UniProtKB/Swiss-Prot annotation, chain A:
The chain holds residues 192 to 285 of 289 of the full protein. This is Minor capsid protein P10. It comes from Paramecium bursaria Chlorella virus 1. It comes from the Viruses. Induction: Expressed in the early-late phase of the viral replicative cycle. The hydrophobic region might anchor the protein in the underlying inner membrane. Keywords: Capsid protein, Disulfide bond, Late protein, Virion. The keyword Disulfide bond applies.
From Swiss-Prot, chain B:
It is found in: Virion membrane. The chain holds residues 102 to 208 of 210 of the full protein. Disulfide bonds join 3-30, 93-100. Stabilized by 2 intramolecular disulfide bonds. One of the minor capsid proteins that constitute a network internal to the major capsid proteins and outside the lipid membrane. The minor capsid proteins glue and stabilize the capsomers. Keywords: Capsid protein, Disulfide bond, Late protein, Membrane, Transmembrane, Virion. The transmembrane regions anchor the protein in the membrane of the underlying inner membrane. This is Minor capsid protein P9. Induction: Expressed in the late phase of the viral replicative cycle. Interacts with the major capsid protein. The keyword Membrane applies. It comes from Paramecium bursaria Chlorella virus 1. GO terms for cellular component: membrane; viral capsid; virion membrane.
Curated annotation (Swiss-Prot), chain E:
It is found in: Virion. GO terms for cellular component: viral capsid. This is Major capsid protein. Myristoylated at the C-terminus. Glycans are attached at residues 277, 299, 396, 403. It comes from the Viruses. The lineage of its organism: Viruses, Varidnaviria, Bamfordvirae, Nucleocytoviricota, Megaviricetes. The keyword Iron does not apply. Keywords: Capsid protein, Glycoprotein, Late protein, Lipid-binding, Virion. It comes from Paramecium bursaria Chlorella virus 1 (PBCV-1). The viral capsid possesses up to five major capsid protein variants. They behave as asymmetric capsid components. Induction: Expressed in the late phase of the viral replicative cycle. One of its GO terms (molecular function) is structural molecule activity. InterPro entries: Capsid_N, MCP_C, MCP_C_sf, VP_dsDNA_II.
UniProtKB/Swiss-Prot annotation, chain I:
The chain holds residues 99 to 146 of 437 of the full protein. It comes from Paramecium bursaria Chlorella virus 1 (PBCV-1). The viral capsid possesses up to five major capsid protein variants. They behave as asymmetric capsid components. Major capsid protein self-assembles to form an icosahedral capsid with a pseudo T=169 symmetry, about 190 nm in diameter, and consisting of 1680 major capsid proteins trimers. The capsid consists in 5040 copies of the major capsid protein (hexamers), 60 copies of the penton protein (pentamers) and 1800 minor capsid proteins of different types. The minor capsid proteins form a hexagonal network below the outer capsid shell, stabilizing the capsid by binding neighboring capsomers together. This is Major capsid protein. It comes from the Viruses.
Amino acid sequence: GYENSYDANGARLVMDGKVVKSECQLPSYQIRNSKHHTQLPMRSLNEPPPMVEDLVDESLFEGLQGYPVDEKLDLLTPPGTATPSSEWAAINYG
Amino acid sequence: KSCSKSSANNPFSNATVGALLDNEARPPACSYDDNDMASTMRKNFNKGLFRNLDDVYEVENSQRQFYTMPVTTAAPDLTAFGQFLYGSKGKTCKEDPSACTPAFATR
Amino acid sequence: GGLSQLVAYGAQDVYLTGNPQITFFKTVYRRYTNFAIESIQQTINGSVGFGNKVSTQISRNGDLITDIVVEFVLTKGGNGGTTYYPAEELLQDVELEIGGQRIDKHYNDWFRTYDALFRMNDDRYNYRRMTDWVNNELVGAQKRFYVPLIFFFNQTPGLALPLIALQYHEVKLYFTLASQVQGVNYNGSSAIAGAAQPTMSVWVDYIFLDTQERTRFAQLPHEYLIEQLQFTGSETATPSATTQASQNIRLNFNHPTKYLAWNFNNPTNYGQYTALANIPGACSGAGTAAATVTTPDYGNTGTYNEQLAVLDSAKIQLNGQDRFATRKGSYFNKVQPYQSIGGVTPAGVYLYSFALKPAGRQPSGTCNFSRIDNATLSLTYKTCSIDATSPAAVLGNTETVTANTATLLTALNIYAKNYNVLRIMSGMGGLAYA
Amino acid sequence: GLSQLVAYGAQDVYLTGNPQITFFKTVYRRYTNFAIESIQQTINGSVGFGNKVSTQISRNGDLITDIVVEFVLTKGGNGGTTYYPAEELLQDVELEIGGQRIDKHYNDWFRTYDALFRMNDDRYNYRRMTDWVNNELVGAQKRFYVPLIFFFNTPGLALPLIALQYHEVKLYFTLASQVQGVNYNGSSAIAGAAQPTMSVWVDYIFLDTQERTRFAQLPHEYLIEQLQFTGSETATPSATTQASQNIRLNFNHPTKYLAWNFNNPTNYGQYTALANIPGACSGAGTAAATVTTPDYGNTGTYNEQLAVLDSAKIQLNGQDRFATRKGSYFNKVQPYQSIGGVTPAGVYLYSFALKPAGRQPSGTCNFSRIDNATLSLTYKTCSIDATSPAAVLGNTETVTANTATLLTALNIYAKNYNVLRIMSGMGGLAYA
Amino acid sequence: GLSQLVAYGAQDVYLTGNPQITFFKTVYRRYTNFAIESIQQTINGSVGFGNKVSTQISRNGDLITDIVVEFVLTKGGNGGTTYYPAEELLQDVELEIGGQRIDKHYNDWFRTYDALFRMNDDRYNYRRMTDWVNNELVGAQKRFYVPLIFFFNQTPGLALPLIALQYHEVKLYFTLASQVQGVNYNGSSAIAGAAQPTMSVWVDYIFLDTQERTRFAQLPHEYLIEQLQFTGSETATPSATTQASQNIRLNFNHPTKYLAWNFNNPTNYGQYTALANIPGACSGAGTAAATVTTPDYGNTGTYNEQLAVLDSAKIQLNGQDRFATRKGSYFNKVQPYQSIGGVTPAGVYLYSFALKPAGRQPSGTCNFSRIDNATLSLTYKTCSIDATSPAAVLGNTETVTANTATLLTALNIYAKNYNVLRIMSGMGGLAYA
Amino acid sequence: VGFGNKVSTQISRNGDLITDIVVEFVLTKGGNGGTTYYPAEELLQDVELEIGGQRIDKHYNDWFRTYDALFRMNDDRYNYRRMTDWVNNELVGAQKRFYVPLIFFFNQTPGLALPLIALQYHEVKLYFTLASQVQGVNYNGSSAIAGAAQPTMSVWVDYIFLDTQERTRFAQLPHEYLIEQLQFTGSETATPSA
Amino acid sequence: ATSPAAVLGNTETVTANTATLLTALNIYAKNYNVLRIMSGMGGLAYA
Amino acid sequence: GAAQPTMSVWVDYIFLDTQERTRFAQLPHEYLIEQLQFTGSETATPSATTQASQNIRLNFNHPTKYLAWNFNNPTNYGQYTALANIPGACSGAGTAA
Amino acid sequence: EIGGQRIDKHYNDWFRTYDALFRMNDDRYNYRRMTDWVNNELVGAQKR
């Protein structure tokens, strides 16, 4: 009967044997003010796109996995500038 | 349109026996993409479920074994399935003489 | 070194490397959904044995299904050389039904024809290893065999059947087991005393989806472009030693067809698509005094020696119009598959493609037989004048003749591989039109 | 499979987070509304041994792909006396558009090409269409099918005859004066041998209205391949030394690869020395063996001991383009890396391309910017007595058979790119 | 064109909701200009049997892919006495970048890899470059080429950007076997006078033009690469009286593509099956002189299942069955049918957690880093067959094998997995330790 | 159904809740008294409980023996033996119907009856494996017994039919049941010696 | 094991020579999990 | 006959009181810690007639407290010096053997 | 490794080099006593 605890969404969390009373006990609270890079649950939005197939490009390439080089290629954290607090993945349970 | 609302007693709007004495001719659940009922579906899904703060991806609580069946209404909705398989391209070559093209019928 | 090549740059290179679009040295892979694949045994109804008909309903364990493998355990009713793909012979047919609608149907002979045309190299050998005895096993030997199904969802995950989306429809596989299998319970026409009945089990590989994709499959309408096999069994115009028999076969085929395939055979001996002869491998005991041209060397039933094939030439005629110029049987046996598949097709097995790549899944041109009031396959046979018991006649003869034993190839099996549309909505599956 | 789905961690995010594709649902990119028909062409000139014939490809369809030349040959001897005789018969084929030569294949090229690029059952089936492979006997008749290997012969490519309304496309085929096991046996003619029957078939593509119109009216630039070929004298190998040679290579254009072989002009496909070991000579392995004549049906072999190249390097503009490597590098490793098939002894490949077996360019050497391209060869010492299997089989890396000195012809090939420009009903190559 | 299409049978087609292109409308892609050169490396340490040698890959080009190790071996006996001796000789290779071990291959892995993933003529040619396949005789000398199979040695797509690694060298550490069958030893017996090997390491380096050299040298790069995990163990040696069983804790981590394993006789390289007096199954097999204590080395590998020892197996993850228990023949013939398309020899087994385990592109993985307790459970066949009597071997049942199958006392379990190779500002290493 | 075969059953929605499940087997003695040991228990090699495709639990013949050894007692144990074995010195050829109760959590108490009515879209299945050999029935030690009969099998499910008020609550409300599971692995014993 | 004098006597730490045939070990654990039913479907709270 | 090692890893754990425990759980932390960077190189082996020399790139990063190095014989663990016939400097040093 | 990240790594040679430079006197001797046999032990001897 824990009607006064941290509801994640619909679930009450448990971290060190006891039910999470408030958000101040969670680890995410230490980085709750930084715009995080990725949020660990990763809910996909609207279905993923299908796998387009063709018999022209696969037959012409004869394998050779021609990879496109004009992509975005999301960079990493430069070794000199520490690791930005944003790089810590938020594990927003609720 | 008339998107059903997953409630606390029927968190997935699956309409098992949940249509008794309340919306017997129940409308469809929700498309799960349009009208974002996914967050409220997961919020209804817990209602007193205790996660261990180690399962950060929300998968150890057997959420893969919970979903919405393709039919959430009282009928199997054979008219949509029938209009999905056939019925399209109205006015055939046999009836009105303008839709025929020198070849045979469609297949 | 390599640098001396990079410097060798001019106008002709612009067409290959100027304003480059792609590279080959830092690949980009695509992120994909989470899934897992599990092999789950099905419960099969009805006694399994020779001549029995059994079936199974696929359990809703995963969300999507793909591979299906039928296991059999057979024993040898004789020594090495007495069997020929016996697991294939045993599985006489397989029907695929969804919601009570028949979707497709394969035959033991189809599995053999399909293999003859579409598998190759080590895949073909490995395939043989799973359906026959290939290490000179002896009488009494026991082996487990694996016969994969080749229905559209058994070929690629892309066409996995979304079982999760079929709330009101079951998918069932009906398997007919042959009354007899050569070298297992029968030897030619004779039964083998003491032969064992087969053990059987059916396995299905179930795709377990993540929550996001699982949910989308359950709720979204689904459409797939899938394959079906059509089949018409018929009699071969009796080949004859005195002439070139000919035949016009009306093909009761429909839908966009990737290709036609056919073979002639002696229904007595599974996989026999050619005439028998006293040359090594071409008959039981071939090459020696004890050779007979009435029974094959079962372990070597198939051959690439076209002399023993029955068909001289053929064409397909549509509504009275030639579809292509008449070509020799060797054109269908060797060139067609050279071009369209890339494997090596045994004598007596023929292919004619309407598609650039019939061996693919991607459509690449099809003949829609639903639009051909009269589709006819026209066949001309070789004169069966070769004395099959005399290698000089068998090996030194002309293009237009075959073995006197080719008159035993009285069965004709014509297949057509086509497309259809599979649709799922409101818990129900079945075929559709587009 | 639920127990695997639960096993999800940080390491998986790179593979499945924010997924881009799904393996369980496919869509096709390409559609057709196209038909394929096999049509016989008319052959001009007389068909026979040593004759030259030609055909104009009829404008029956809009695009063309495969071309297969059918030839009826008969056996002038028993099984084992022929070696790819339909390949040998078709001495060469020229491809001409608008009168411009586009390309040319040679019987030896077909053999070299096959040696490097065909494989497994594909290769066997090819052999089935060009030779007798079921121990056929003298007098046997067979219809052979020789597919051509021009730039338009993968299903995704075709030659646009429809876009060439004012230019004809022709094939000129030279038939060999002699074919082993058909009308000649070594140097001897075979009395009573039949003349060949020939038929040329072209597979045509019939396009729908929109696709057809575009090909017929729009300008095009088709990236095509061409074969360059230079024949030369081989520095003759010797029991006394390691022969060496520098062959100047008069090649041009972006080249995917270079290939070569050494051979005995007398025997088609003989790229190796003869020896008294099974398959290496007529009657090899027994008393009747002769190391002056091949077992024709087994002319090709993988036993490098009978090959003559010790090592080689290719020099470009006076620079060494790579470190000198052994003949076995070119024979086994190069095709391992670049093709994935198995190349017979005596045939060598050096690729500039990641995958020369495709159509898509994947690295080329542009010889139009190379003033001095030279192939530098080192030959093996011909000191091994070919009639003594122990000598043949128990020897070292730098030596070969005394009979290896018979492989006096050197064939060097280069496969390159060019551009075939087609517009306003006419066309031709941008570079020559 | 419509009248023609109807005449040939209408060949009209199905279109989808995705952008469509006609079948014959194609284009070639323009790609970065590059060149590839084969350059000899300097190998440090003495080359010989049982010795360890190493090399640093010279910064001659910008990227590296294929690596071929040349060896020159001689025959210490006649044809039929060797089995892939060049592969046997290269006992193992360690791949190290910046001092971090990235990966490691073993001679047995090369054999297992080959058994599962190479095929047809590709496989034959591989054999041609690693063995004496033309009945060569004693005293024969030959140059063998052993390609390495590290992730960057299989696809140009993972070419290691030496250019982007200005501070980290990449090294190869190669262990040469103390003995190689048919070269310096015949079974357990040394061959007096046997020659020591000659070794050379070749690296095929890619030279890039300006735009890519610049992009690689300065931009951070993240590569999805393969690693081979390996745990060697004792086989629960099959009994001649019953069916042995074993539960092997799998000390594996990472998003694994597949597991692979074999049972073997550690004495004889590549022997994954029992010996028998049937052609090819033992030295002198099929005749009076046959012995079932020594293999026909040239025919060590076989597809004859009767000589294999695995009856059945399952993988259990965190206490639950991952799949229903299947027969050894499933893992030997069906798994590779389903996922590879080649033909796997008896005694070699595969289980994929991926749709396409043979490809570069990830297609389903088993992340063992999230499986606290993974185990491979094995059931063995009963070794009661008298191997010297073909009837006993070839006319027998499914769950029974050769008495000589108890010689397959060593077990090798492999797992191939993905990891991430991160390269920044001239240095790099693996994201997951 | 037969020795060594795998069979299965799905529980139909005949009632609202389910509790007890008893599997009947009919066997004939392959030898005399003293040759069998709880043969119906041995025969039930295993049983897997699956709901909606997810394994909930799984028992093994050995588990049934272990469970019994620890938790049954007195005449509960004796009566149990009477339902799985021959305990009145029956002789070869004797035929007997055995009743092998399942011990899944819902098969022991009404309190955990599975709410089949609330599981409208999930199938509840029992997968059964019958032993390849049963001592004193079709095998004697390692030896097969010629002429031994194959088992006859039947699965009985005891259903609870609820009145309107209780039935309605089960049908409409979400549920939570504290349940038991059996975890099991086999290991090699570090065999001791003299 | 064939001699009652050795079997019914002897000491606490010594068993039958035939005890070496007990080569298999079966370890079981019975535990509590939670079965959750909602919307016509069910499964376990802890996987 | 050599035996395989028996191994076990022991960790000494610190148990905090309520107050310190709370601070660790709620406060962010940073520690200034040490790391070891290491690479192996071939020695420009000297010889009887010469003083070899070598320039070794120091492929290191981060604030470095110190460098350390040794030369060794890979065969013999801990051997950083030459062998000699003087007591302790070689097997049997100082005697006939 | 922490969180999958490689934080650090020591090598047997490093332990030897480290000891050679930073341990000393009886710290070094006591260390040696925990990693070696220093009381003239003979073949077959076993120690933790």
